[PDB]
Ligand binder design. Sequence first.
Ligand SMILES: *Cc1cc2c(cc1C)nc1c(=O)[nH]c(=O)nc-1n2C[C@H](O)[C@H](O)[C@H](O)COP(=O)(O)OP(=O)(O)OC[C@H]1O[C@@H](n2cnc3c(N)ncnc32)[C@H](O)[C@@H]1O
Ligand SMILES: *Cc1cc2c(cc1C)nc1c(=O)[nH]c(=O)nc-1n2C[C@H](O)[C@H](O)[C@H](O)COP(=O)(O)OP(=O)(O)OC[C@H]1O[C@@H](n2cnc3c(N)ncnc32)[C@H](O)[C@@H]1O
Ligand SMILES: CC(C)=CCC/C(C)=C/CC/C(C)=C/CO
Ligand SMILES: CC(C)=CCC/C(C)=C/CC/C(C)=C/CO
Lengths: 499, 494
Amino acid sequence: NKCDVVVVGGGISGMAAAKLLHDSGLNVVVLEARDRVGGRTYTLRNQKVKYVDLGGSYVGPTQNRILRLAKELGLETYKVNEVERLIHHVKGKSYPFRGPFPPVWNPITYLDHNNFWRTMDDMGREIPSDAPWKAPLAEEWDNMTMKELLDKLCWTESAKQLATLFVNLCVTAETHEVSALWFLWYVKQCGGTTRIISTTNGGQERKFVGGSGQVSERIMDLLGDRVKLERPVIYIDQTRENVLVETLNHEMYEAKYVISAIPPTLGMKIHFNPPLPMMRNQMITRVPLGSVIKCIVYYKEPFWRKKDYCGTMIIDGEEAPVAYTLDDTKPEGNYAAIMGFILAHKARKLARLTKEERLKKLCELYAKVLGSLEALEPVHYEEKNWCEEQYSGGCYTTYFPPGILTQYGRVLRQPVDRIYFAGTETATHWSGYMEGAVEAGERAAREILHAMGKIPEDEIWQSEPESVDVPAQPITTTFLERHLPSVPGLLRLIGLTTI
Amino acid sequence: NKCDVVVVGGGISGMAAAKLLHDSGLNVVVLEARDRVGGRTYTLRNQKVKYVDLGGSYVGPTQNRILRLAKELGLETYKVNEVERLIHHVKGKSYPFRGPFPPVWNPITYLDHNNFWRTMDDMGREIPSDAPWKAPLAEEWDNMTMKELLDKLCWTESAKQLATLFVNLCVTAETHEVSALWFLWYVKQCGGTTRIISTTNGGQERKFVGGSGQVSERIMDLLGDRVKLERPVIYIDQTRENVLVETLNHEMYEAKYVISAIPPTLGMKIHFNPPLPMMRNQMITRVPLGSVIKCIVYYKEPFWRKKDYCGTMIIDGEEAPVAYTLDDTKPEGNYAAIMGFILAHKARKLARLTKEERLKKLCELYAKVLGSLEALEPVHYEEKNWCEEQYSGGCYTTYFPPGILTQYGRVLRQPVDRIYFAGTETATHWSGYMEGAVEAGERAAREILHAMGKIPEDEIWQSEPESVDVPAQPITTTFLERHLPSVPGLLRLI
Ligand SMILES: *Cc1cc2c(cc1C)nc1c(=O)[nH]c(=O)nc-1n2C[C@H](O)[C@H](O)[C@H](O)COP(=O)(O)OP(=O)(O)OC[C@H]1O[C@@H](n2cnc3c(N)ncnc32)[C@H](O)[C@@H]1O
Ligand SMILES: *Cc1cc2c(cc1C)nc1c(=O)[nH]c(=O)nc-1n2C[C@H](O)[C@H](O)[C@H](O)COP(=O)(O)OP(=O)(O)OC[C@H]1O[C@@H](n2cnc3c(N)ncnc32)[C@H](O)[C@@H]1O
Ligand SMILES: CC(C)=CCC/C(C)=C/CC/C(C)=C/CO
Ligand SMILES: CC(C)=CCC/C(C)=C/CC/C(C)=C/CO
């Protein structure tokens, strides 16, 4: 019945919030819709895989909050395999390479590729992390899709195709589905293009030993019976002295404050009294989550390494079911595996097939890309379609269609009376990620601590010391990368000398 | 507890569905979330206004289903005032005119305006009403916003500005918010540009005497205690022999079938067991409703008529709070009034003000446009902001952002086990309107009648005889309208 704070949702964000509040001496209850904690993280255990992340998995340098939280819980990381060459597969052929960006030889195409990535970051520098709608050209950029932006920016098909893949992979949505402003914000708030795309020195550097689901599970262990499973919240009443929160099983919870730690659109599953203010009422119908199937194919050995391939494949083209893969082999070198994502419209199209049909299409793709018949001999397969989850709505995260972020964005983490808002979608650094979940949950908890007079306004937003275990190397560019002209820039230089 | 069919939602669609099933001899229950029926229609009664429609109001020729249903319930219509001149207000000046389309005098601008409207209809002819995702260029058109389309199509700022106003008014959304394919479908399925924009011989020809809320109220009267008010549905369970439907007050209802007669995205307010199939699960997070405040300013007399103005104003520009008005005066000539819409981003911006501040801005605008100081002397004001409604989500209707209709559109009216889908959003003719609500409710009810073996598949979709009271005149074009070149077309001839 009665407590200090009810947290709605037992994903990483809700669990981080609850843990902070609990450590501060308050009585907290976590109401979780599912028969498990973790949300968009899920670690499956069986004898064939030992453990496998079917949801969120990767962490890396500059993600100091998730790293600190997991270390406190007794977790360790290991490095994703990137010793050997990466592969860019374009127009039916594989081109091995090293370094984060797929290289290009054609001088015109080189200028176009260089300019695309540079311009993404240039534009991002004008967008405040904590208030993207404050960018000088916020309106113009928000009223365009990423498809429109790419059409104007990319002078070669080669750059446009790679750029399209980048968007599909970053946000599991099509270029025509998403606001240019929101996407530019999304990349900037992860530290930019290099940081977001990189394995070594980027967002995909590491995974947790034993799975990321242990973060939420081990917090649940600390909280004991304060976490209530199979308690979907259906109703929140703020008309009286104490806030009343009701679940689907008719249980009633009374609290001083509430933290909503669920995807913004999933707030629609709750009936509010009094009704939400107009801007939030409409906002929560305007913010879908992307579409992805995470697929892991198991093999007897990590055979790709013997051909000097690390397992990373960047795969261009409509025909390919998977556009991106990473080596998912255990750090011990056993349970050899390739992880791959089926993205956006392909997730919709291929969900029609059976599990066995999808396994076949993936093996046949990998055999082609890796040039290896061994790829046709899987020993096991695991997969998870996140589009089917009632209490997630999609993965990895929420995207904003054109026009929404400038009109409704300021509403996202604005408290509604005694309801405060967490969830990775409300973060200002690595929003969309486990790191953003920790930032948002802890910030929401501190907002309540301030409302109770326990801390000064000063302490609501707190910086995080850099991890000693996962240090960040700075992002650098070369003189040529900074100053080489764009394609239209070269054409004007050509017009100039005609004098 | 037990019945043949539970209908979720007591708007026109739910009520039309329940009425059909009831008349066929089945036991129906209507579960309505609010303390009233009518949904996106709402008729307010008081001494100052007598009655006023604060939600859906207009009906016209080709809307034969709403007209038949209303007539059966004992309702009459009257004609919206369009005797005198309409006004197009552009760049701070009023230009009176006659006929449905605001005219232009510059020759290049004429070609551009003519081509814009014509192209909207040309493109619409390639889009099947019952399956817009089957259009030959479905993907290309769905991957563009209406803003992009207008940028390519409109060679003059004059046409682009009018076209933008058209989009804002039709679907209460910005051009950059909505899919080009969805918008072209939307116009086509109302019968095209002339039919959708016209008062005389179009969608805005008429209103109901006493208000449109009477449609839902009078069906409630027929159904008696079968309508349950303040019963928001929270849970639907389809795992067992009979479907179980639970409300917020913990009441439990058992049925053979369910009709969901609520806006698609409002399906999110219901927890499903088993979970919805993946496509519907995601679809219902991708389909928002538009933004509008409906505002009615009352005056001692319909003073605009004395200046040979009917009360219709088409008002261009960012500064104007209201882009479109109609005469809302009663057929008797009393309760003189102007109805206006505050649309899309302006609804969001101006909601911050007080009621009195909004009234002042509207009166000042109307004084300018009508060229009359009398507009500064209102006797009364009524307004409704539909963006604040938990059980509507907006108005008039659901819009589709780029990419959604092709990927998720086929899911809209696909049954989920024993749940069938009504609501104006599922109609194929005047979807978005009270007419579409009726079509969809009755079609969903007949789907259940077929599933029960009471009617053949043949009878699920049924044509409607033309109203004798509101006959449709055909839409015509002139030889010059059909064959005059576009601006780029003239440039190639040069
Ligand atoms: C799915 C996914 C996510 C993902 C990604 C790949 C996939 C396939 N890869 C990632 C990666 O490699 N690294 C990373 O950092 N992130 C990655 N992502 C995203 C990541 O998993 C998410 O950002 C993060 O897990 C989100 O955490 P958050 O706490 O903000 O949100 P949640 O996990 O969705 O938790 C919400 C919980 O609330 C419950 N819920 C929902 N509705 C209710 C109601 N009505 N009542 C009570 N509880 C409710 C959910 O069940 C969930 O547990
Ligand atoms: C608001 C509006 C609408 C409108 C328009 C101008 C405005 C400001 N002008 C129109 C016009 O001039 N002519 C016309 O034909 N239409 C016009 N529109 C649109 C029109 O009002 C709508 O298309 C029509 O009313 C829609 O009817 P429908 O039956 O399909 O939908 P509804 O009215 O929204 O009814 C839904 C009912 O369901 C209840 N509800 C919602 N959630 C639940 C739950 N969970 N449980 C039980 N009931 C629920 C709603 O309360 C509503 O009553
Ligand atoms: C290497 C290139 C061209 C693109 C990589 C883009 C990217 C963000 C990959 C990471 C995808 C991922 C694991 C998302 C889940 O957080
Ligand atoms: C005549 C012009 C330029 C625009 C009119 C367009 C239009 C659809 C008007 C009707 C608006 C309305 C009452 C919508 C609600 O159904």
